[PDB]
């Protein structure tokens, strides 16, 4: 096959799905413990720590809120940066109520999503 293909679980490709364009893989990356999200925007882009459950201490609000806010937040540190409308990257999972969470994160953030 190909590396990722003999392996599995992944679909980094639907990642590509978005890669086409629409601005940035506002990518939610999750490992229950926490979540951390970055921004891969086309052109061998980069990022800007917009959201992580450790850039501001792993509270104790667990999922629900945790994601709510860290999201809103990322959205904002970001607009500070100067973006506008970003594009949703389901790092993985079926936009799990968790992702859902990060998601409204950008949502309310204002982060157009």
């Amino acid at each position: 096959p190909m590396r990722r293909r003999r392996e599995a679980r992944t679909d980094y490709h639907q990642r590509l799905r978005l890669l086409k364009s629409g601005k940035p893989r506002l990518v939610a990356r999750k490992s229950n413990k926490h979540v951390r999200a970055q921004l891969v925007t086309p052109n061998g882009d980069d990022t800007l720590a917009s959201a992580h459950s450790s850039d501001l201490a792993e509270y104790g609000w667990e999922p629900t809120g945790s994601a709510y806010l860290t999201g809103l937040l990322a959205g904002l540190r970001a607009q500070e940066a100067g973006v506008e409308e970003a594009v949703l990257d389901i790092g993985l999972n079926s936009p799990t109520p968790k992702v859902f969470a990060i998601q409204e994160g950008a949502i309310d953030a204002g982060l157009d999503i």
């Binding site: 003999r6 392996e7 599995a8 679980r9």
Partner: protein
Amino acid sequence: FHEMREPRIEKVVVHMGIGHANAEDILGEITGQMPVRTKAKRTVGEFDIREGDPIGAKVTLRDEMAEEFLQTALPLAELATSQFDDTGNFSFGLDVTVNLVRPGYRVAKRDKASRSIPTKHR
């Protein structure tokens, strides 16, 4: 680290499958994890040619529920030798197959670095 090798329930399968509609219902009452799996072939050894027919029934039960069963039914069984086989697994009754699980075990499912299960851990 004996804190390893020494086991922990990982897959028990209970079933049946006539070339044929509800007997599997009987299953149902017996357990709680359905198993509609099409059976095959193309000849008359039982008038089984219709190459494509729902006819294989398999109530999968690992751990938990499989505990309800290992318990409830382990009594009606009566052999306890021979029907013991190699890869650390065995089977008996009108369609029963269980699989031991030494600690190397799990590695085997990985799509990645799927270690060919060292016949020294299993």
